[PDB]
Amino acid sequence: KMSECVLGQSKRVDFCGKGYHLMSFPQSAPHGVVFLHVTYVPAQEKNFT
Amino acid sequence: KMSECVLGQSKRVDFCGKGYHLMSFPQSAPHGVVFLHVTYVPAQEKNFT
Numbered sequence: 001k002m003s004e005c006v007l008g009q010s011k012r013v014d015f016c017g018k019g020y021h022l023m024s025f026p027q028s029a030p031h032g033v034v035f036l037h038v039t040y041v042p043a044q045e046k047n048f049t
Numbered sequence: 050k051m052s053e054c055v056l057g058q059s060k061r062v063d064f065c066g067k068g069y070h071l072m073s074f075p076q077s078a079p080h081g082v083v084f085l086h087v088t089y090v091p092a093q094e095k096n097f098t
C-alpha cells in the first residue's frame with residue numbers, strides 16, 4: 001500500500017480506500033502505520049434518456 | 050509476478066522493479082526464480098514556467 005497508494009495513483013477497486021482514488025498520506029503509529037486515503041465520490045444523480 | 054510482469058505490462062508501483070515498467074525476462078535459479086526487470090527512468094530535467 002505504501003508504494004501503490006502513496007507513491008502513485010491506483011485503479012485497484014477498494015485497495016486504497018472507498019471511492020475513486022486520488023491520493024494518500026502516511027502517519028506513523030506506535031507499532032504500525034496509518035494511511036489517510038483521499039477518494040472522489042460522485043453525488044446527486046439525475047435521470048436522462 | 051510471472052503473470053503480471055512477464056506476460057504483460059503492469060502499472061503497479063514497485064511491483065516490477067524501480068522505475069516505469071517496460072518489460073521483464075525470467076531466469077531459472079536453483080529452487081527459485083530470478084526476474085530481470087527493464088524500466089524507464091527519466092533524466093536531465095530542466096525547469097520551466
Ligand SMILES: *[C@@H]1O[C@H](CO)[C@@H](O[C@@H]2O[C@H](CO)[C@@H](O)[C@H](O)[C@H]2NC(C)=O)[C@H](O)[C@H]1NC(C)=O
Pocket residue numbers: 045046047
Ligand atoms: C428516475 O426515474 C425513476 C422512475 O422512472 C425514479 O424512480 C422512483 O423511485 C422511487 C424510489 O427511489 C419510487 O418511490 C418512485 O415511485 C419512482 N418513480 C417512478 C415514476 O416510478 C427515480 O427516482 C428517478 N431518479 C432520480 C435520480 O431522480
Ligand SMILES: *[C@@H]1O[C@H](CO)[C@@H](O[C@@H]2O[C@H](CO)[C@@H](O)[C@H](O)[C@H]2NC(C)=O)[C@H](O)[C@H]1NC(C)=O
Pocket residue numbers: 094095096
Ligand atoms: C531549477 O531551479 C531551482 C531553483 O528555483 C534549482 O534549485 C536550486 O538549485 C541550486 C543548485 O543546486 C541550489 O543551490 C539552490 O538552493 C536551489 N534553490 C532552491 C530554492 O532550492 C534547481 O536546481 C533548478 N533545476 C535545474 C535542472 O537546474
